[PDB]
Design a protein around this ligand. Structure first.
Ligand SMILES: N[C@@H](CSOO)C(=O)O
Ligand SMILES: [Fe+2]
Length: 186
């Protein structure tokens, strides 16, 4: 039974229930993420920005079933084109807007990766990606508004691949957390 999360803490409690089993009902998880109305006071602890690039700030470890984290995107900050290591990946906007660009898995032949589509993700909207859908890049293209997003990955993963847009070539990358549970972790 899916109820509206009243607060971020409530959302977390609901997620623990939804991930208590061995599978994941994606539509249910997306619906609950979308239903949480971003309240900046509740996540200010985690919203730690860096001048030069976006930051990943761990919020909850899901009793081992998922990682929930907050990403903070300065003006003009964006990601690489990347995959999600055979995991579910949900993204919900807490502040600002992000541009998501979708790409196909490259062929073994060296070629320009062409975008399959783009969309603008707006405050409170929750998107979903997985490797069967394709790859993506996420970017804050704003010149005037920082963005903040809430991401859930299940199972948790700390490595993925970045793809070169000009060739499709992939390189393994290890993601790092800027902070964990509100504490900066250099
Ligand atoms: N995959 C990127 C964020 S775009 O992923 O929804 C990351 O976790 O750093
Ligand atoms: Fe991503």
């Amino acid at each position: 039974e899916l109820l509206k999360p009243r607060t971020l803490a409530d959302l977390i409690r609901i997620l623990h229930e939804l991930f208590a089993g061995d599978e994941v009902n994606v539509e249910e998880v997306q619906a609950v993420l979308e239903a949480y109305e971003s309240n900046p006071a509740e996540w200010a602890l985690y919203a730690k920005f860096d001048q030069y690039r976006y930051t990943r700030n761990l919020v909850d470890q899901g009793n081992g079933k998922f990682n929930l984290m907050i990403l903070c995107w300065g003006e003009g900050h964006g990601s690489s084109i990347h995959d999600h290591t055979d995991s579910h990946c949900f993204l919900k906007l807490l502040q600002g807007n992000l541009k998501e660009t979708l790409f196909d898995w490259p062929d073994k032949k060296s070629n320009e990766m062409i975008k399959k589509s783009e969309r603008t993700l707006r405050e409170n909207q929750c998107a979903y990606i997985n490797d069967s859908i394709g790859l993506h890049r996420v970017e804050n293209v704003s010149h005037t508004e920082p963005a903040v997003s809430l991401h859930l990955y299940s199972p948790p993963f700390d490595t993925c691949h970045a793809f070169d847009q000009r060739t499709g070539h992939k390189n393994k990358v290890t993601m790092t957390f800027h902070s964990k549970f509100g504490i900066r972790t250099p």
